Every structure is written in C-alpha cells, then in structure tokens.
Amino acid sequence: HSEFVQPLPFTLPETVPLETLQRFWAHPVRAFFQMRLQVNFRTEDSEIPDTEPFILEGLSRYQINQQLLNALVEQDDAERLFRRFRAAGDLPYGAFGEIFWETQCQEMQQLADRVIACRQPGQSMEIDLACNGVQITGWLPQVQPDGLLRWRPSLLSVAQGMQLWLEHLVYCASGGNGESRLFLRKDGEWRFPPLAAEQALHYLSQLIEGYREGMSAPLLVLPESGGAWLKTCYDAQNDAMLDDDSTLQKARTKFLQAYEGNMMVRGEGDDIWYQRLWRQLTPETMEAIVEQSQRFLLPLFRFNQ
Amino acid sequence: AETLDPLRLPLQGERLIEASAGTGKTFTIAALYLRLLLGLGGSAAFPRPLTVEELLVVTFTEAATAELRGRIRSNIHELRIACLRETTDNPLYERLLEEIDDKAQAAQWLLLAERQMDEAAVFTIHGFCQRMLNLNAFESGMLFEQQLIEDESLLRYQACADFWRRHCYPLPREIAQVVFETWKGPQALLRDINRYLQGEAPVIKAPPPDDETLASRHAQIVARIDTVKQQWRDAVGELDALIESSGIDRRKFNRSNQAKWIDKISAWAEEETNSYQLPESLEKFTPRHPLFEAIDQLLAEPLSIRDLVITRALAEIRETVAREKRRRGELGFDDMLSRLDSALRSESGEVLAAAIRTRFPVAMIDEFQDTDPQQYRIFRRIWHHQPETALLLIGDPKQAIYAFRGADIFTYMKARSEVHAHYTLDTNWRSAPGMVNSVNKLFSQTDDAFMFREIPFIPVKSAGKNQALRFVFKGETQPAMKMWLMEGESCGVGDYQSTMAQVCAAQIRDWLQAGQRGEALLMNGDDARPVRASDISVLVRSRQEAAQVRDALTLLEIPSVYLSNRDSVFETLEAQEMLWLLQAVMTPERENTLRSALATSMMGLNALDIETLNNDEHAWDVVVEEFDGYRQIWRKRGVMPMLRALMSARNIAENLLATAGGERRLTDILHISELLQEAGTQLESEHALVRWLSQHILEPDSNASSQQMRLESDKHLVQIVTIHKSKGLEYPLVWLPFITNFRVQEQAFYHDRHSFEAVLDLNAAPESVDLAEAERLAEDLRLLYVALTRSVWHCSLGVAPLVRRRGDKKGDTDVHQSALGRLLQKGEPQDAAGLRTCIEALCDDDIAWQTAQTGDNQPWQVNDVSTAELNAKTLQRLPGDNWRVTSYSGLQPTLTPHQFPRGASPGTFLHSLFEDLDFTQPVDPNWVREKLELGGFESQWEPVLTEWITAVLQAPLNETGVSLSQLSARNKQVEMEFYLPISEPLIASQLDTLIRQFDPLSAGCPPLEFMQVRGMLKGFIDLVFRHEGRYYLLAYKSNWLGEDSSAYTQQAMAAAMQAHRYDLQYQLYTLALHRYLRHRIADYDYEHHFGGVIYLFLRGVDKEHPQQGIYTTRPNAGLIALMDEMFAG
DNA sequence: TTTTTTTTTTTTGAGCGACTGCACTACAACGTTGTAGTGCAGTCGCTCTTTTTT
C-alpha cells in the first residue's frame, strides 16, 4: 500500500472567498478531503434512543446552551425559553429539567456578565482584500467599534483561537484598529491586540500560502495536539522556545494526551479523517506535525494575552 | 491437611481436594473417573460400580469441559488397551491394573464406557441446572420450552428506567435536588448497583423500614437540621472558649457565615464552619454548651438519601426484571440457579433432590473456588450427609480471582468448615524447581500470608522429571525469579509504568536478539531449545497498561498479540469501510457515496488515483458499470460472491498481505464478511443487511462470535494476557511489570467472618471499609499467586516504591498496601531503602534482583528468507453435465363465473374443489359452504357455485357423450404423478420439427428456447379414467381472464392452447400414459386402448353449449412411437 | 389530483488531593518588630480493571 500523500497540481484562483479559508483552517485534513478530491466520508446518523433524555450531554446540551446564551445576550426572558424547551420535550420531566435549566442559566449568566460587560452595537461589514494577487471577498458580522466580539459556549480550544485569529487578520487589514476577543466557558478567553496593516498582510499571505499548500499536499497541522505541544514548548516571558529535555518530554506527554484521549473524552486521533492517512502515529509523522504546528500555529500563542 | 493419593481416596461422604497451581488436576479428575467406573479402592471403594450416565462432572468453562471429556475418553481407551494387554507404561496405570483381580469384566466395562461416552454426564453448572429443571419440571415448576437471552443489560436498564420514572418523577424540588446531587440520572444508579443486581442479592445492614418514603426521610433530615439551627440561634452572641495559639481570632467571622447559613431549610449541604464548632476538634486545638455536642451529633452520620433509594432500587428493579422475563417466558443464566434454589427451598423439592440422588449418586465438582453461594446451597441440599452418595469438591482457594463475577471465597471457607477431610497435591509438574523454591520462599515468610485463617499455604514439591529445567543466558545461568527494582525514592504511576514497559521491552529485545544466535536457551537435561517470540509473555491486569506495553513493544519493531482482547470487530474502521462499500453497491447512482467508498483504506488508492478518476469520465463510467455488476452479483448470488469478486478483481487481498500490518485488517474484513453473510441469509431484503450492519456498528455489545480473533498462528508473537485469562495456561518466560500497582476499594461490600454472608453497608462506616479492604487485599494476594505460578523457566517482577498518596516525599511508601509488599516487607510499613533491604535480604540462587536501566541500542533483526515456488491447479473439464429434474413449468347478473377473481390461488382452489369432490355423489350446498368457509371466499357465491358445479358435471365431455357421473371410484384416478427419464440431450430444434411434422396446432407458435435436459421429468396429470374398455386423460384449466361473453369457441381455445404452449404438456402426457399402459398391461396397443385427451376450461362451460368449455384432441399415433424412441435412446 | 427543491459542522470531566502565594494574628526579641502557625485562594497531577455460563 503506497502512501496517500501525493504531490498534486493546484493553481490558486484569483477570487478566494473568506468562507473557504474558514472551512480550511477549521479542519485542514477535512478540507483536503472534501474539497480538493471531493471525498467527504458520510457517517450514518445515530439511532433513536429507547428512553427519554434524563441528562443533557453532547449536541443537545450545546444547542440548549447556545440558545440560552443568545437569549441572555439580549436580556430576554429565560423563563419563556424554558417553557419553549420544555414544550418540545428536550428537557427532562418534572423538577430535574428545572434544576438543569437553573444551573445552565447560572452558568450562562456568569458568562453574560463578562460578555455584555464590553458589548457595543455593531453591524456586519464587507471585506474586499487583494493579497499577492489573490482576491478575498466576504462579510464580517457584528463589527463593533471596539473591535471583534465573539461568544460561544465551548471550552478553551485552538480551533476557535485560529478562527478568531483569521477574523482578526481579515478585520485589521482594512482599517479597524482594536482588539479581538472571544469568551469561552470556565474563564476561557482568546485576546489578540491590534497590529499594523503590513504585519496583518504578511500573516494573511502566510495563511494564503498555507491554504495553497494544503490543496496540493495534505497539510498535517493538528490544531489541538499541535497547539498543546507548542504551548508546552513556548515561553511567553522570553518569546523563545525552550530546548531542554524536560520540556521535550512534557510536550510529548501533552501530545500523547491530546491525540489519543481518555475513556471519557474523545481524543483527536479518534477521527475518520486522520485514520485514513496513517493507522499508527509514527514519530516521523509526529515530528512533521510538530514542525507544521511550529510553522503555522506560532502567531496563535505569540499574540495571546 | 493430608496428601492425596488417587488410588487411596475414600469415596464416601464429602471430600475436599485442594489442587495447587500447576498440579495434575485434569489427570486426577480422569483417575477418579476411572476409579468410579471400575469401582476400585478395596475398603475405601464405592459400594457398587457406576455407569457413564451416573457420574456427574461439574466444571464452569465449556472448553474446559470439552478438554476434560476428551482426556477422560483417551484415558478410558488407554486403560482398556492396558487391561486387554495386561501391561502398561505408566506407574499409576500399573497400580490400577494391579488393584483389580479380574481382567475380562473390567475390559467389558471399559468397552461399555467407551460406547456410552457420548451419553456422559459431563456438563457445566448452568447446563446441569437447565437439565435438572427440564427433566424434573413438576417439582420445580419450570416451562418445558424457554428462550435463553445472552444479554440482560437491556431489560435491566429498562427496569431501572421504570424505577426512575415511578420514583423520581413525582418528587418536589427539595427532594429532587438531593436526588440530582446523588445521581445525575438512572445510568449512574445502574452503574452503581450493577454488581448487586446480578447474582444473589446481598443482605443490607440496617435497612430502612418499609413505610419510610423519600419524603419522610427528607422531613426527618430537615427537622434534624432545624433543631441544630434553633440551638445555634438560641446560643448565639456568646463565646466562652479559651483562645489558643492554633485558634485564630477570625472564628466569629465563621460564626457570621453561620449567620448567613440559617435562612431557609430548602438546602441540604451544611457549611464547613460547623467543623470548627466540634468539641473533639476544639479540645485538641473548653466546650461547655451542648450546642457543640449537637453539631458533632449532626456531623457524626452523613445526611444522605442515597441508601433508601438504593434499597428501593434493589427491591424494585430485580422484581421488575423477573416479572418481565416471566411475562415474556424468557430465562437467564442466573435464573436457572435461582429456580433450582427455589425448588430445593420448597417442601416437596427435597424429595426432588432424592430424585437427583436417584439420577446421579455421585458428584465431582471441579473449580470450587468459582462457586456462587446458591450453588453451594444446592450442593448442600442434595449431597450433605445422605448415604451411598459421594461428593468430591476439587478446587484451589489460592486461585479465587473471580470475585467480581459472582464467586466468593467465604463460601469456600464455609465449605471447608463444614467438611472434615482435606486432601492436597504435593507434587508440581509444570514449573522448574527453582521457581517452586522461589514461590515457597516468598509465600512462607510469615504465617497465614493470604491473611485468612481458613486458607493455609503449604510448601509444594517439584517434579522429578523436570528437575533439570534451566533458562540459561549467554553469560551464565539466569536465576528463576528476578525482581527488577526500579531505582528512585518516589515516583508516580504513569512514569513508573512507562519505565517498566521500556525495561520489559529491552529485556524482550535482548532475549530475542540473543535467542536467534543460540545464546539464550531453555535446557532440559541435555536437550536445548532456542527462545522464540511466543515464549516471553507479559502479564498485565488492565487494558490501558496492556496498550502501553503493546505500544512500547511495537516501538522497538517487535509485534505483539493480545489474547485478552475482547473488543468487537464492528467498532473498528473496517466495519465503517464495509458499510460505505455496501452503501456504494446498493446506491451506485449517487457519485458521492461511491467516491467516499473508493477512497477508503480497503481499496488502497492514492490521491492522484482519486483525482484522475474524478477527471476521467470514462474511468468513472467503467467504475459505475463494474459496481452495477457487483450489485447484480449481490442480488443474484449473495454477499460473499460479491465480496469475493471485489477482492479478486481489485486484488485488494494481495495488497493487504503485502502491506506491513494489513494481515490483521484482512482477517477482520473476512470476519465481518462472514458475519454479514451469516446475517444476510435470514433477511430477504437487501437493504435490511445494510441496516443490520449500521445497527451493529452503533451497538458496541460483545457476543461470542462478534469478537476479534487471532491474526496469525505461524509467526511467533509476544502474547499479552491478563491475570484472569492466564488461569490454567502455561508460559516459559513471564514478565510482570505492573505487579506492584494496586487499587483502593471505595464501596463497603464485605462478608461476615462468622455467618459467611454478603453484607452491603450503604453508610460510610470505616469498619466496613476496612473489612472490604481486607477482602480486596486477599483478592490481590490471590491474583499475585495466580500471576506468579504460571512461569515455568523464568519470571521477572517489577518492584518500585509506589505511593498511592498524592504527597511526593512523606517518608513512607504504600507498597505495604499492595500484595507484593505484604510478602516483601512482611506486612510492615517501610521506605524505599527498607524495601531495598527487604529485597536484598531474601537472596538465594533462584531469587536475584537488578536495577532498572533505561536504554535502547537497536530494535530487532528480521533475518528474512525467500519464499518457495508454488502454483494453483486448474480444472480441465466441466464438473457435471446439465442434469436437472424439472417439470412442465421449468420448460416454459351480479354473481357469475365470468366475474370470478382470476388468479393462481383461485385456480388452485378450483382444482382442489374438483379433486376433493366425488363425481358419483350429488353436490350438497352445505358442503360447498363448508369448503368456502375453509378456503375463505365469499358466502354469497355459494348457491351460484353449486349450480355451476352441477352444470359442469352434467355436461358430457366425450365423442360419444359420456358424462363424469358414470365414472366409478375404481375407474377414476386423480392427480397421477409420473417421472419420465431421458438420456439424450434434449435439443429444441430436433424436437420442435418432430412435433410440427404431426401436430396440426403447430402452424404458428414459434419454438421456445430451453437448454439440454438429461435426467428425469416430473408431471402431474389431473385425471385418468377408463370407460367401456378405453382409457381417457383429462386436465383442468381455470384462469380464463380475457373472456366474459360466449366467444370461447374452438378457435379461441386453440389460440389459447397455442399461446400458453399446452401442446408439449399434452404430448408428454400421452407419452407417459402410453408408457404406463405398456408397462402395466401386457400386449398393449395404442389405437385399441387409448381414446383421447380432454381439456376442461371451467369458465367456458355453458348449459346450452356442450362444445364450449371442453376441448378433445387425439394424436396421430405416429408421434408417440418416435417420441418414445427419442426419449429412450 | 397535479407536484418543488436542498448539501454546512458544532460538543464533550470533575472530585480528591497537593504546591505555592498572600493575608492574619500570637508571641518572644530588641512600644515596636521579626518569626511562626493557620486560613483562603489561584494553580496543577490524576485517573476511572478483569468475564461467561444453552
């Protein structure tokens, strides 16, 4: 069996939309599969459960938290949304659904005390950029004069930081002096300071080069495990990467923890897009993923505050 | 205890055989079986010899019963040969032959035993219980036929959901908050009580009363908190305790927190500051008021609603499961034990036990350590002190490691306290004497090393034939036990596991590097054997450390297999690839599923191949065409033909075998293919197998067939096996890297030291926790003994100062809390230097130690060799000629009969009506009504049906005018079935011209196409009847859909005969009748006896038209002889 | 009684126990100040077995 990675011919078009770059940097291997060779692995949906949901976990809990966060960001009545979700059967029956709604309302109110603390009314604006003869056309929603304000009921992850960094690069390149902030759960916060237009265009050209490299060859940039390895090896005090053996062992430990998860959290290695390339994580491909994450995910932790 | 002799064991009453690990237990069972068959022993013998259908052998594992039955059969054959020859090569067989005086009767009894070994009573526990429930079903009250279910988790989860619906739903908020604080849902409660719902229900110490509900307990705890709140509100505003150096002056602020505590009684968890108001803690840091005493009384017991809900769940869920299985009529594995225990618990069922004494007046029960208390209660109900019956409990208390499954060592201790005689096996035939001396040195450091008074350890003796077993290295003779002490003061768990896995992988690659050069050897006397990869085995306890060992061994290019892998094949990527392939085969029109299935790892295509397949439209056309051909093979031939054609055309099997690591993938693909072919035969639909595959992907449940198998047996691999799966096996070299890792049990479920019953303490009492931790430590010591006594030549141990406590350097380590440190440190808490001195104290020639060195030089050396030349045979000719036994079908006003429904089923119903009705007797209308009631047609058609039947029967069908009523019962013959032979290849072109030469109806009718039929031809003639010395044939046709008027003349009937091709059927009927009249009647002439063939169209018979409906045709009497000459040869 | 479209994923660990930093008072050394003991809060390792009976 020959290797699936092969050098393919690819010509970068003139007009590349921002949605294509967002879908690329959300998952690079999936964007190499489902867009270049148009192979999207379609998994069958889960079966209907035999009983009513007694607890909230997974996609249903995330949708309930997202609707509760969108309702509390406008200071709307949470009890009306409680009656709306109880009328559909997505909540548990009786007092347990009320307990779940009370603790989720407490968590979303604790988050909204930080979200609407620095929220200004902003409208969606247009983005038309020309970088290295490549046209980027798109739209940015809810652009406030303070900068970029995004809120999602998720954990501290590197993919949302990459999305916020891409939005900050596409926002600061055409005016827009100000910070970019994203507020996650459990006091998670991604902040990026405003930068000049030249550094923003340089980083945007680097991301465009990474996009045109990801279409020819499968760009092995793991967001979660590569970001964990990088933040284990990065030092924000001296702005230099450490080279001692203890940090090289702790980064390998964090990489093995983030790639293959525990028996309760699905790790990054348990994915249909990564098992097609390799069946066992070889140290050569591990060092290749480490080098690609050091090349690409470095301004994520360099401008983090 | 006493030593056990197989020829001196008294087979009277109850005997307890303690067979140690490695001893010949399977040989001793066969020796006692031969002793019970022949009736040997003299004074200690049985009073009468027993047959094969009276000897009961009880062993839990089914493969163990099969192996024991085969070994007993081989011993029966060997003893029969040795008794017929009066000589043998075995000393025990020599003493067996010397004990008998007669030789012919013993040989005849052994021959009868060899003949009746098929009807032997060697069953399992649940099999014997099911046989006793099905046999004597009257005293027990069991159904004759029932359906066993393999998985009981679904009904248990359904009953737990029913309990959570009927208990937790109508609770108010103040109780449901505490219920949510105890468990999130019913799944956590089921995970808590799953070890108690199965098997015997334990006794709960201090249970709640039956009238106390959740609301009463909640109100009691609310009043208990409110009394303390009232006593705090009355005694507030004063402080009389002396100020100490430990006591800070901010305690009143904590009292201010209590001023924020007494607001409402809706909460359940009190403040931590009440721990500052304890008289036992304030005196150690002066308490005068009894408010501190009331606070200490409140904090003495945990305020929890958990115990009442657990008691109600154990009372409700098991009853709901039993009610559901009694309604559905199903049975379970433990249900047979419960039914037999309830049968023997009754009054008349004791007499049923006497029937069991009528059935088998003996019992030999193997593996008595894995015995439920219900099983021992049954065996005490049957075979306690009754005469003429013998009980032989063969087991080992040092191997009871199945306490999680339902076994209990306290039942074995009760059995040892009940019986009087004890027998042990002194000789050990498995391991080297160095390992035997190491085991007898390690486990006999202190008295009662297994910490129970009823489990004694004895020094075992090694074998005389295996006293020269030596595992030699390149340098010198390697000792038996080598405790690899990990260097360091204190370490974690994962770092210790990683370092010991690296040390074990280095030892494996060193033994395999020196083993292929003839340096490291296994020597028996002068014989030598090189150490292969299958000799070294790593003994782990869990799956995480097994995966760690597998990764640390495949890092050094050493392949390793996992014998204890119970993962399903439907949970891997290959099941998803097979699902994508079946979805692409079933729906090949949509290119998205086909493109997603072609790029899988099973096909083995690169990205450039997928790009060129998406660019070239003709290649995708060829792919869609061959996938449509695969779908046609899948619809016409089945699952396995389509998969074999896919693996042969794409040649993916050769590519997977050439790929390093693809053989396991190919075996998993073949197993998934076999399971899909097994499930696809029971389903007629094609999408149903795809839905079943998607369901089994979504269902991770493990069956006996749906588990992963061994990938290869020819190539030697390092076998990883758990401690429970290594019971009864044998390994040359054993490595135990994680034998120092222990776990602390949190739940309080123990056994009483006097009554020997299971006591579950739902409260957090420290005495129950200590009494459960003692049984946990005994189970860990038994696991240590089981893991140590499997090595033959060499065992290696990993010792390290492991600290379960989170403190880094506290001056003490927790190795005394493990099983190995209780024997090394003699049950005393010590340090790392103390553990090192305890290791270095017991140093002999067999027991040594070395430090753990981390280092790697080279992975391995493959040393490959070229494969031998081979080819495949090709079939030269056809396997068989076209031989087939076929029939004619294989070679091809408001109520009126015109308004009758036209179909195959009404045609067969009218044929059955004309077959069952007697022609001489007049038609009765009530008989027609009964036949229409039996058939299921309308009742209004009956008075028209009977007059239509009489109008058909009154109409004659002959050239002279002979009706059907003139035919007697002897003259008629209905539904004559004939077989016609043909030895020539039936060519249609040579037959149709011969038909058209004589038959006038073949003017049109272009000839049908059929293959050469050589063999037999089946036929069913409707009616044959004789009249005035002339035979006649009659057939019935009743479809007639296209005619409603009187247009059924002779021309329309001839057109129907030419269209439906009934001419060949009538010609074969004339040939069959000619051959039958030639064979039956001697001197037969075709023109003299045969009269003609009549076809009867039922819907064409009219009262005014006698010719319409009937069709009379007679052959030319020249085609029949030529057809007979053609069919003959 | 006829008949229309449509290709975008997301999320998921928390209790038990230790390390370290800041504040707070008790008490002895040189009215005031340094050292010691304890309490609260932010930050971080770690870890959750084994199996088969018709």
XYZ file of C-alpha atoms in Angstrom, chain B residues 299-675:
377
model
C -21.834 15.566 61.619
C -21.387 12.059 63.060
C -23.501 10.406 60.349
C -23.768 11.558 56.715
C -27.125 13.105 55.839
C -27.813 11.142 52.659
C -30.961 9.953 50.889
C -28.823 7.534 48.827
C -29.303 4.405 50.969
C -33.116 4.431 50.808
C -33.102 4.883 47.018
C -30.544 2.063 46.673
C -32.694 -0.220 48.863
C -35.855 0.605 46.887
C -33.959 0.032 43.623
C -32.692 -3.369 44.794
C -36.248 -4.240 45.854
C -37.928 -2.979 42.663
C -35.605 -3.497 39.667
C -34.951 -7.219 40.228
C -38.684 -7.822 40.721
C -39.456 -5.900 37.516
C -36.829 -7.907 35.596
C -38.283 -11.180 36.923
C -41.816 -10.005 36.056
C -40.778 -9.076 32.504
C -38.984 -12.394 31.975
C -41.972 -14.289 33.402
C -44.321 -12.415 31.060
C -42.084 -12.989 28.026
C -41.247 -16.547 29.098
C -37.500 -15.985 28.831
C -34.780 -17.303 31.128
C -31.316 -16.183 32.157
C -28.069 -17.751 33.295
C -28.544 -16.970 36.994
C -32.285 -17.628 36.629
C -31.580 -21.369 36.388
C -29.664 -21.202 39.683
C -32.464 -19.164 41.287
C -35.125 -21.598 40.031
C -33.205 -24.626 41.319
C -32.616 -22.900 44.671
C -36.317 -22.031 44.974
C -37.210 -25.607 44.009
C -34.922 -27.094 46.665
C -36.117 -24.437 49.136
C -39.668 -25.839 48.993
C -41.094 -28.799 50.904
C -41.590 -31.361 48.122
C -38.430 -30.291 46.269
C -36.242 -32.023 48.863
C -37.771 -35.262 47.548
C -36.769 -33.903 44.126
C -33.211 -33.851 45.490
C -33.747 -37.535 46.293
C -34.637 -37.920 42.612
C -31.266 -36.306 41.910
C -29.877 -38.955 44.258
C -31.764 -41.354 42.002
C -30.223 -39.620 38.983
C -26.544 -39.262 39.931
C -25.457 -40.777 43.274
C -22.023 -39.127 42.959
C -20.589 -35.669 42.283
C -17.126 -34.469 41.241
C -17.149 -30.667 41.206
C -14.136 -29.006 39.587
C -13.153 -25.343 40.162
C -14.890 -24.950 43.512
C -13.332 -21.513 44.076
C -15.680 -20.128 41.395
C -18.832 -21.212 43.217
C -21.823 -18.994 43.953
C -23.488 -19.338 47.388
C -26.666 -20.539 45.641
C -24.622 -23.346 44.064
C -23.179 -24.417 47.419
C -26.653 -24.192 48.982
C -27.920 -26.539 46.245
C -24.985 -28.936 46.721
C -25.577 -28.918 50.488
C -29.280 -29.555 49.871
C -28.532 -32.618 47.730
C -25.296 -34.198 48.992
C -24.784 -33.191 52.628
C -24.862 -36.397 54.701
C -27.014 -38.840 52.714
C -25.609 -42.385 52.362
C -24.320 -44.072 49.167
C -23.531 -40.708 47.509
C -20.050 -39.190 47.293
C -19.091 -35.522 46.962
C -15.630 -34.504 45.714
C -15.019 -30.737 45.768
C -11.816 -30.281 43.746
C -10.550 -26.722 43.803
C -7.998 -24.187 44.978
C -8.575 -21.305 47.437
C -5.444 -19.548 46.130
C -6.995 -19.166 42.645
C -10.285 -17.447 43.595
C -9.847 -14.355 41.421
C -13.397 -14.163 40.007
C -14.958 -12.239 42.907
C -16.153 -9.525 40.504
C -18.159 -12.108 38.538
C -20.062 -13.576 41.492
C -17.676 -16.036 43.108
C -16.873 -15.814 46.812
C -14.017 -17.277 48.848
C -16.134 -17.088 52.021
C -18.386 -19.778 50.534
C -15.268 -21.925 50.103
C -14.292 -21.215 53.715
C -17.805 -22.214 54.821
C -17.437 -25.416 52.783
C -14.049 -26.092 54.390
C -15.520 -25.510 57.858
C -18.430 -27.854 57.100
C -16.435 -30.812 55.724
C -13.943 -32.776 57.842
C -11.394 -34.352 55.478
C -8.840 -32.355 53.483
C -6.561 -33.576 50.687
C -3.752 -31.758 48.873
C -1.494 -32.466 45.890
C 2.157 -32.321 46.940
C 3.815 -32.701 43.527
C 4.041 -29.880 40.979
C 4.621 -30.953 37.375
C 4.688 -27.623 35.499
C 7.460 -25.304 36.688
C 11.167 -25.676 37.388
C 12.230 -26.485 40.987
C 13.908 -23.071 41.213
C 10.580 -21.322 40.630
C 8.932 -23.735 43.090
C 11.538 -22.880 45.742
C 11.085 -19.164 44.981
C 7.306 -19.445 45.460
C 7.740 -21.473 48.664
C 10.256 -18.902 49.937
C 8.206 -15.802 49.085
C 4.804 -17.011 50.321
C 6.111 -18.633 53.538
C 7.854 -15.591 55.016
C 5.162 -15.104 57.676
C 2.272 -17.236 58.913
C -1.057 -17.024 57.012
C 0.252 -14.988 54.087
C -3.217 -14.961 52.482
C -4.437 -13.195 55.700
C -7.356 -15.622 56.222
C -7.313 -18.350 58.860
C -9.089 -20.886 56.626
C -6.674 -20.528 53.676
C -3.375 -22.239 54.606
C -0.277 -22.302 52.418
C 1.853 -25.444 52.158
C 5.344 -25.952 50.654
C 4.807 -27.744 47.347
C 7.210 -30.249 45.797
C 8.622 -30.097 42.280
C 8.620 -32.897 39.720
C 11.437 -35.403 39.391
C 11.350 -35.457 35.588
C 11.517 -31.641 35.334
C 14.298 -31.016 37.876
C 16.822 -30.049 35.161
C 14.869 -27.142 33.627
C 17.275 -24.211 33.258
C 16.851 -20.890 31.452
C 20.456 -20.083 30.514
C 21.767 -16.787 29.156
C 24.938 -16.020 27.199
C 26.886 -15.117 30.341
C 25.776 -17.672 32.935
C 22.717 -19.459 34.323
C 19.868 -16.992 34.832
C 18.001 -17.342 38.158
C 14.322 -18.196 38.437
C 12.842 -15.025 39.954
C 14.465 -11.670 39.136
C 12.773 -8.746 40.905
C 13.697 -5.707 38.799
C 13.820 -2.950 41.414
C 13.151 0.447 39.852
C 15.717 2.978 41.066
C 14.368 6.038 42.849
C 12.827 7.332 46.079
C 9.259 8.126 44.983
C 7.615 8.001 41.562
C 4.172 8.329 40.028
C 2.030 5.712 38.333
C 2.310 6.550 34.634
C 6.044 7.273 34.724
C 6.658 4.014 36.610
C 4.507 2.159 34.061
C 6.386 3.745 31.143
C 9.822 2.993 32.621
C 8.904 -0.606 33.455
C 7.399 -1.055 29.978
C 10.651 0.219 28.453
C 12.681 -2.109 30.709
C 10.432 -5.046 29.751
C 10.756 -4.183 26.046
C 14.545 -4.007 26.440
C 14.527 -7.424 28.129
C 12.312 -8.823 25.348
C 14.589 -7.488 22.599
C 17.648 -8.771 24.488
C 16.146 -12.257 24.841
C 15.133 -12.259 21.166
C 18.458 -10.820 19.975
C 20.480 -13.471 21.824
C 17.870 -16.168 21.175
C 18.349 -16.233 17.399
C 22.106 -16.858 17.778
C 21.903 -19.847 20.128
C 22.994 -17.966 23.264
C 19.879 -17.820 25.469
C 18.401 -21.310 25.734
C 15.893 -23.437 27.619
C 17.685 -26.619 28.694
C 16.016 -29.827 29.882
C 18.901 -32.087 30.876
C 20.942 -32.222 27.679
C 18.143 -31.056 25.365
C 18.194 -27.396 24.339
C 15.602 -25.089 22.794
C 16.016 -21.523 21.480
C 13.733 -18.829 22.869
C 11.259 -17.674 20.216
C 8.863 -14.715 20.371
C 5.973 -16.862 21.650
C 7.843 -17.879 24.821
C 8.047 -14.459 26.506
C 4.682 -13.275 27.844
C 3.834 -10.036 29.655
C 1.240 -10.375 32.426
C -0.826 -7.203 32.879
C -4.086 -6.533 34.733
C -5.988 -3.877 32.741
C -6.368 -2.747 29.130
C -4.626 0.639 29.477
C -1.323 -0.850 30.636
C -1.753 -3.608 28.033
C -1.972 -0.943 25.316
C 1.043 0.765 26.913
C 3.026 -2.499 26.748
C 1.896 -3.042 23.138
C 2.993 0.475 22.136
C 6.325 0.205 23.983
C 6.936 -3.160 22.284
C 5.948 -2.054 18.769
C 8.222 0.976 19.212
C 11.167 -1.467 19.083
C 9.874 -3.310 15.954
C 8.506 -6.268 17.933
C 4.964 -7.398 17.021
C 2.749 -8.442 19.920
C -0.691 -10.047 20.072
C -3.316 -9.513 22.789
C -5.003 -12.737 23.891
C -7.313 -10.919 26.330
C -8.667 -8.553 23.651
C -12.472 -8.721 23.838
C -13.136 -5.775 21.525
C -15.810 -6.136 18.864
C -14.970 -6.205 15.166
C -17.866 -3.811 14.446
C -16.172 -0.975 16.381
C -13.114 -0.638 14.117
C -12.630 1.352 10.912
C -13.068 -1.750 8.731
C -16.748 -2.079 9.670
C -17.302 1.537 8.609
C -15.440 0.851 5.353
C -17.626 -2.212 4.724
C -20.710 -0.088 5.456
C -19.527 2.562 2.972
C -18.853 -0.161 0.386
C -22.315 -1.688 0.869
C -23.890 1.772 0.588
C -21.953 2.384 -2.638
C -23.025 -1.007 -4.025
C -26.685 -0.556 -3.028
C -26.884 3.033 -4.357
C -24.372 3.409 -7.215
C -26.244 6.279 -8.907
C -25.154 8.979 -6.447
C -21.431 9.503 -7.007
C -20.781 10.956 -3.535
C -21.140 7.647 -1.671
C -19.130 5.822 -4.357
C -16.349 8.421 -4.177
C -16.364 8.215 -0.371
C -16.160 4.407 -0.504
C -13.458 4.174 -3.187
C -11.020 6.365 -1.228
C -11.069 4.087 1.833
C -8.062 2.119 3.066
C -9.648 -1.149 1.884
C -9.340 -0.223 -1.800
C -5.827 1.183 -1.395
C -5.812 4.147 -3.777
C -3.688 7.289 -3.736
C -4.917 10.872 -4.008
C -3.637 11.058 -7.596
C -5.717 7.982 -8.462
C -8.846 9.605 -6.990
C -8.074 12.844 -8.869
C -7.602 11.026 -12.191
C -10.779 9.035 -11.514
C -12.699 12.275 -10.924
C -11.177 13.874 -14.039
C -11.619 10.979 -16.494
C -15.330 10.414 -17.111
C -14.780 7.110 -18.939
C -12.925 5.578 -15.984
C -15.801 6.609 -13.711
C -18.185 5.050 -16.255
C -16.214 1.783 -16.023
C -16.313 2.049 -12.209
C -20.100 2.595 -12.194
C -20.564 -0.310 -14.638
C -18.484 -2.732 -12.559
C -20.240 -1.594 -9.371
C -23.585 -2.249 -11.073
C -22.223 -5.697 -11.917
C -21.275 -6.110 -8.252
C -24.838 -5.108 -7.331
C -26.204 -7.702 -9.776
C -23.959 -10.367 -8.208
C -25.122 -9.181 -4.765
C -28.780 -9.513 -5.779
C -28.434 -12.823 -7.650
C -25.652 -14.700 -5.827
C -25.343 -13.128 -2.365
C -22.912 -11.302 -0.082
C -19.780 -13.497 -0.161
C -19.788 -13.903 -4.009
C -19.885 -10.102 -4.396
C -17.145 -9.644 -1.790
C -15.000 -12.395 -3.342
C -15.388 -10.881 -6.820
C -14.484 -7.474 -5.366
C -11.392 -8.873 -3.629
C -10.381 -10.791 -6.776
C -10.973 -8.075 -9.391
C -9.466 -5.192 -7.403
C -6.794 -7.582 -5.971
C -7.003 -5.915 -2.560
C -6.175 -9.106 -0.625
C -2.682 -9.331 -2.151
C -2.158 -5.617 -1.469
C -3.255 -6.032 2.157
C -0.986 -9.058 2.604
C 1.952 -7.187 1.056
C 1.289 -4.258 3.407
C 3.049 -4.479 6.769
C 0.305 -4.664 9.385
C -2.544 -5.374 6.958
C -2.989 -9.054 7.818
C -4.980 -8.174 10.953
C -7.079 -5.830 8.798
C -7.667 -8.600 6.240
C -8.693 -11.105 8.932
C -11.080 -8.529 10.420
C -12.503 -7.871 6.934
C -13.006 -11.620 6.398
C -14.682 -11.972 9.809
C -17.006 -9.027 9.079
C -17.779 -10.657 5.713
C -18.600 -13.970 7.421
C -20.868 -12.227 9.944
